[PDB]
């Protein structure tokens, strides 16, 4: 009989005050949480944030919502949550978030005979994540998600992960175009402010970037042009037109790479690991052309010395460029 | 007993009139304010504004909400704020702001037995900031945030920082990848409009741009190419193909840097300090190509005069470029 169920629910909401937490003036109400990560949409270095979609469930017990005689879990309409008390949980490090509302508002209420309440939500949040791009594109990131109560201290509310380390699910199925999730952790602690001490729940991911792509697109073209500038050392110094044209075109080609990759690379201005490599290769092509000027100046009066300089330039330049790579990779890998 | 607490809260709001300010007709109500800054998301030179996320606490006293017999501070639900009087505080220079509302609206009401009301909000605002980009990228900005009462005058309401210089906390949390927080000040004053006078509170920061990025990407490539154009003076003047190709390719390379730099830097439609330097280098490479044309025109009939011009060019060109940098850097630093 659905008329009997209607009376039971209406009796619960009669005299129910939503301004008072359960066990007001008594022990703090324990709230358990768990998250199902639907997806991680985009990770942006420019804006220093990432987008997250998840199913956020909260668990708590309210003795004011205890019913008897109905051996069922009442899954009521989602509009009844506006007449109950719910925790004031907010995400401490989010820039913009919302609850999906198509076709109806994505919300769940599921009462239990003993007064327990299950409160589910579907949220798309854009949490902030500061990044250390010194080693870009060989960097490793650690983006977090902080969960905290807004108005109630530890004297009123408490947080814990429901199920221990198995609270968060779906992380293993997440695929990112540019990163790769390595590990995730769950942290529970208390945070002290001027007003008081607040419960805290933390979820963090460790992101490792994929370096294989950057080898072909970025590092390989710069290396080939640097090797191509060494061809001038194998041309006789009397061919002024050939060596100058080769020397200055590689410089022009090196600037084209720098001024066109920065458009593709994120526009966050400060020195990165890739910038030091491109500038390092820019010096070698610059010195290769500057070396010929020394030879072309003394080849008419000192042919023996000019030939000797070209012989040594065929060894010093390839050898020094190998030392530059060896120091670079060890310092960054 | 939760029933007793419900009676007290209902008694306070019974007959309460939200349309009348506290202590109506008497002394002005003092509203102490303190701000806890969360982060400064971004600073934009194109739109001349910065995005700020903060905790905005307001602290006044209303005798109508005084209660006795309850030795506790009533931390009520955030939905009770709609039934109380709150100041009409607004930010004068804000362009787009909102209160976070996931999972609930980030709002707080905490009453005290004497009638003191603590009212906190979590607000993300995009305040306008006039910028003087003449000295860009060596500039130093000063962005502000204006707090003012829209309706009431100085006789009705008063604003003051709660705690003096300790009112604003969390300045060290600001991590701008491009700027560096140098100083922040707190100002209290009065403002007169055509419709009356209003109290004013001001929070202002001072920002200094980081110059490390512009050295690698902008200044260094331009200096090396300008140096690379001096190689022409060390090549025998009968090698027309070598000196012309070197001279005209540096001009082409210099234009590539300038044209592909305005497409990456923020589009600031007036003259800055970075345009003067690039235009100065473009003149030097342009003059180095004119020098050879004069040499190429007179070397057949006056071999001595053409050779003399080449020797003096090896000294004058490097020397006058040093004066250009010495004047430029000292003026802008």
């Amino acid at each position, epitope marked *: 009989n659905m008329s009997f169920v209607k009376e039971t629910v209406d009796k619960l909401l009669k005299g129910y005050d939503i301004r008072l937490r359960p066990d007001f003036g008594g022990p703090p109400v324990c709230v358990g949480m768990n998250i199902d990560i639907a997806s991680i949409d985009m990770v942006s270095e420019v804006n220093m944030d990432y987008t997250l979609t998840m199913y956020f469930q909260q668990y708590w017990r309210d003795k004011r919502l205890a019913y008897s005689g109905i051996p069922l879990n009442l899954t009521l309409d989602n509009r009844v949550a506006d007449q109950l008390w719910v925790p004031d949980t907010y995400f*401490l*490090n989010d820039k913009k978030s919302f609850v999906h509302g198509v076709t109806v508002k994505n919300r769940m209420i599921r009462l239990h005979p003993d007064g327990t309440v299950l409160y589910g939500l579907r949220i798309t949040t854009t949490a902030a994540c*500061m990044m*250390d791009l010194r080693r870009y594109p060989l960097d490793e990131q*650690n983006c*977090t998600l*902080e969960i905290e109560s807004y108005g109630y201290t530890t004297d009123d509310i408490e947080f814990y992960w429901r199920g221990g380390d198995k609270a968060v699910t779906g992380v293993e199925r997440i695929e990112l175009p540019q990163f790769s999730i390595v590990e995730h952790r769950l942290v529970s602690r*208390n*945070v*002290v*402010f*001027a007003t008081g001490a*607040y419960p805290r729940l933390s979820l963090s991911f460790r992101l490792k970037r994929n370096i294989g792509y950057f080898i072909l697109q970025t590092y390989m073209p710069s290396i080939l042009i640097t090797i191509l500038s060494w061809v001038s050392f194998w041309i006789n110094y009397d061919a002024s037109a050939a060596r100058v044209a080769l020397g200055i075109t590689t410089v022009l080609t090196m600037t084209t790479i720098n001024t066109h990759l920065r458009e593709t690379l994120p526009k966050i201005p400060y020195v990165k690991a890739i910038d030091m490599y491109l500038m390092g290769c820019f010096v070698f092509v610059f010195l290769a052309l500057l070396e010929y000027a020394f030879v072309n100046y003394i080849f008419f009066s000192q042919p023996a010395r000019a030939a000797a300089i070209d012989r040594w330039s065929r060894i010093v330049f390839p050898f020094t460029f190998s030392l530059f790579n060896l120091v670079y990779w060890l310092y960054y890998v | 007993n939760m029933s007793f607490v419900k009676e007290t809260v209902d008694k306070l709001l019974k007959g309460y009139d939200i349309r009348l300010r506290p202590d109506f007709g008497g002394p002005p109500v003092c509203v102490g304010m303190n701000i806890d800054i969360a982060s400064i998301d971004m600073v934009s030179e194109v739109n001349m504004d910065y995005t700020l996320t903060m905790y905005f606490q307001q602290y006044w006293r209303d005798k109508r909400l005084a209660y006795s017999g309850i030795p506790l501070n009533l931390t009520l639900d955030n939905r009770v704020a709609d039934q109380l009087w709150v100041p009409d505080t607004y930010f004068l220079n804000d362009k787009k702001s909102f209160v976070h509302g996931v999972t609930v609206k980030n709002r707080m009401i905490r009453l005290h037995p004497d009638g003191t009301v603590l009212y906190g909000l979590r607000i993300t605002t995009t305040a306008a900031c006039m910028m003087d980009l003449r000295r860009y990228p060596l500039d130093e900005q000063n962005c502000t945030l204006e707090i003012e009462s829209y309706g009431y005058t100085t006789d009705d309401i008063e604003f003051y920082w709660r705690g003096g210089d300790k009112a604003v*906390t969390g*300045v*060290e*949390r*600001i*991590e701008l990848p491009q700027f*560096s*927080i140098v100083e922040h000040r707190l100002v209290s004053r009065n403002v007169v409009f055509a419709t009356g006078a209003y109290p004013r509170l001001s929070l202002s920061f001072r920002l200094k741009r980081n110059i490390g990025y512009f050295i690698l990407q902008t200044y260094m490539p331009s200096i090396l190419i300008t140096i690379l154009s001096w190689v022409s003076f060390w090549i025998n003047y009968d090698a027309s193909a070598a000196r012309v190709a070197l001279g005209i390719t540096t001009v082409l390379t210099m234009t590539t840097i300038n044209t592909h730099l305005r497409e990456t830097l923020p589009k600031i439609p007036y003259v800055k300090a970075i345009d003067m330097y690039l235009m100065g280098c473009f003149v030097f490479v342009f003059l180095a190509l004119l020098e050879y044309a004069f040499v190429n025109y007179i070397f057949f009939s006056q071999p001595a005069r053409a050779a003399a011009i080449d020797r003096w060019s090896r000294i004058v060109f490097p020397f006058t470029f040093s004066l250009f940098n010495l004047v430029y850097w000292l003026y802008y630093v």
Partner: nanobody
Amino acid sequence: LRLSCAASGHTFNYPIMGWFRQAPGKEREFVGAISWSGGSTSYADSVKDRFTISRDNAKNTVYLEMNNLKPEDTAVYYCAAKGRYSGGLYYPTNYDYWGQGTQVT
């Protein structure tokens, strides 16, 4: 008297360094804090204009320049690291990693 605090490891996840002193008869007291990158500093009221804090990222060191010392400043000085979203700055509980006790008289 110039105390220095040196850090290594994942120093980016803990961008704030703080100094605390523990009285023999009282509890830990806040002294000052320094951001690793920005350089902005905060000081306790009793030690304003007498102590100066600065840092360098060349070797990951935080400097505590002590001036106008007084006999009442006898306590064990600690160096601590605070997370990015650890909350308040004047409360020792929010700090995770605590350095070895150092005594200065």
